[PDB]
Amino acid sequence: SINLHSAPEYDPSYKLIQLTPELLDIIQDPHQLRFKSLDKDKSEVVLCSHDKTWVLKQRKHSNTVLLMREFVPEQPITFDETLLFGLSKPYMDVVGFAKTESEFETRETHGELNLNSVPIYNGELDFSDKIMKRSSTKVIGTLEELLENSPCSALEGISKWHKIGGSVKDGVLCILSQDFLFKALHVLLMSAMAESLDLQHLNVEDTHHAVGKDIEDEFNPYTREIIETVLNKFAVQENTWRLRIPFIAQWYGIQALRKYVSGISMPIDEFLIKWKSLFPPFFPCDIDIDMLRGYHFKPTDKTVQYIAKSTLPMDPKERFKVLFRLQSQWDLEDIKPLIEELNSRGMKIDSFIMKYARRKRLGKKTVVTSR
Amino acid sequence: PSVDIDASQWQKLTQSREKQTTVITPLGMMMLEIQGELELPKDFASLARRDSPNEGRFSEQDGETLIRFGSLQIDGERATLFVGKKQRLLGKVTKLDVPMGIMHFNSKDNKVELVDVMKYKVIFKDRPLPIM
């Protein structure tokens, strides 16, 4: 048997944390895990690896939980045992050093950026104005500082920074406006073809040079930092960058849909032409209406019209109602992105659809229609 | 603020050691769970003064007075807990659904250490029985 001892005071600096399989593996790797919080008395505490984020929660319970450790007695522990039964001789001693009335639970969470003193850049030069007419006075200068004050991991943060089009100007972190981001892409693309650059292997220096070599600097907002931002948004690097041509085509197509087929429909091949015309000349891409799945519907099979998902009814039977009203027969994957959000009980997505829709075979192909 | 979890000490001891079964963790720790309150006296110093060597209820370890409150007998997986003179509780050695890290939070430095990782507990859910 084991002799059980207790101290007169427990130490509450000892606490229990759930180690999910992934966290467990890291803890046995062989300082890769980090606790973080915006402040000391207010905000959530998160736990971060290089690559992932967990949130901490605590849950009190009603039982006694003693944490006990083996100890070596200074003197042998002698006492009269008075009964036999079901109790072998002591062979070791343990002492309760902590008593916990709760667990800290660890749950996977989406890392996010803390964007508070960070301005939008639209951006004329003499950005000093927007810098000094801001929220704080304090400047967030570096991405590292931004990350340090964020509820997310290094890699989650960098990835979001690239996806929202983060940049820096005059030593001040900023975020590019949708308009300027798009405009900056357009100018970078124009210039890259004009100088016969390798769009699979771009770098900041050559691309920066290509953009500004015939522009007077004091009127050139496309700094190296801006060029890097645009590459990290619309390209993939590795150390050079590779342009994401389909992503870029879609980006233009969505604008086209908004401009030409917002309240109105248009023949698909005639729309393609107008979509194609927004590109800078000679831009190598073959455009296809299926790149705009989730952003359009087809009132007839040879017409197209724009749709914003956000306008749709929230109840899924209502959503399916409105879509079939707009278009009787849907190719299966045209309609999937417009209804996935409502699939809350994580059904397999094609089961979710057959709950509200019917499959119908025409020629060879399979379409979907209302039940 | 931010701080890393130091698991350095734990990783070397997990190599200088060997065994789990359950028994105890290799580092010498265990988790005891009871459906109830453990009632120990409010004043150890007073009762320790008065302590027979027949009872053997109090001892000094590293500057602390420890009360000897019970005995634990493992036979399965099955476990029996004797508490004080008059109680027997029947319980179970359970493998944890989610292993539990014991972390020590040193407030002076705002630093945190991995003390051990608990994978088993011994738990007692049922009404105490009379002795034997």
Partner: peptide, 27 residues
């Protein structure tokens, strides 16, 4: 007259609602 030690049994078990954690709740 000497030391009395026992478990006061709980008839069952309560797990409370989970709560947020502050930096200070850890230190």
């Amino acid at each position: 007259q000497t030391v009395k030690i026992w478990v006061k049994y709980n008839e069952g078990f309560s797990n409370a609602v989970r709560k947020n954690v502050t930096w200070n709740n850890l230190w």
